Amino acid sequence: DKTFLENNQFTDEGVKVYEFIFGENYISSGGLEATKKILSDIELNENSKVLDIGSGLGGGCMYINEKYGAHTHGIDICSNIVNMANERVSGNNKIIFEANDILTKEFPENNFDLIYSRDAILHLSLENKNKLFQKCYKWLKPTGTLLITDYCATEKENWDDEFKEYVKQRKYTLITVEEYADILTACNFKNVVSKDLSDYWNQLLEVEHKYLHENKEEFLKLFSEKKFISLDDGWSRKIKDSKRKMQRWGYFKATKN
Ligand SMILES: C[N+](C)(C)CCOP(=O)(O)O
């Protein structure tokens, strides 16, 4: 799976294209603005330990460490992206980025105050989503919180041709917001809050889309017209498909006790 992601969706250039539209240090939806919103009700301090699953270019960890002073440990399977993340942080002994497979990584039980993941678990098969959340349950401190956004979808029976092709090409496993919440409940998480944030996601996509159009000249200088068209069309589809709830954006927050 590492090779597949590194050689396709997350080639060096693919990562840089995504960073252009999401914002500096981000490959997750809504970049910095969504990060601020998602963490707006989260309480941590300088003694907190945070795990970021799918840490990408590191913007989320940078923000969490800046806001709270927390120790942040990001894991991402793509070695190239981790290398890029490590280039953007220096002199900070409370931020660590590690290239590894979260499904094989070992952490002590009762270790983290927050386990955070942004638009990363969609790569995992359903079997492996369940396996991951069982691990997360163990790794959380008794007082800890799990906080996730992820790509979700309407039931597969409702998918159209274009959406089927997108999911297939990306090799995503997209489940409903409801099924996702059920996995967390089955893993024994408490106070499971799930929100279908597709409308907010649509707003985020529209801001990103407008930015792309307004900065087309700069994009073409950095990249190419072919890549602009692909990105433009991809965002257009996500805007259309989120409006009609075919492609959805799920938010999940839960606790160990
Ligand atoms: C999923 N992601 C937010 C990390 C990257 C963008 O993926 P996609 O919207 O092009 O499928």
CA of 22 to the centre of ligand 1 (A): 10
State whether the beta carbon of 138 lies less than 6 angstroms from ligand 1. Answer: no
State phi, psi for 174 to the nearest 5 degrees: -105, 120
Distance, in Å, from the CA atom of 21 to the CA atom of 208, rounded to the nearest integer, reads 6
Atom of ligand 1 nearest to the CA of 234: 10
Instruction: Report domain 1-257's class.
Output: alpha beta
CA of 217 to the centre of ligand 1 (A): 23
CA of 234 to the centre of ligand 1 (A): 10
Spans of all domains in the chain: 1-257
Bridge-based pairing state of the strands 95-99 and 71-76: parallel
Give the Å distances, CA to CA, from 46 to 7, 113, 144: 37, 11, 15
Q: Whose CA is nearest to atom 4 of ligand 1?
A: 28
Distance, in Å, from the CA atom of 17 to the CA atom of 220, rounded to the nearest integer, reads 11
State whether the beta carbon of 29 lies less than 6 angstroms from ligand 1. Answer: yes
Distance, in Å, from the CA atom of 228 to the CA atom of 219, rounded to the nearest integer, reads 7
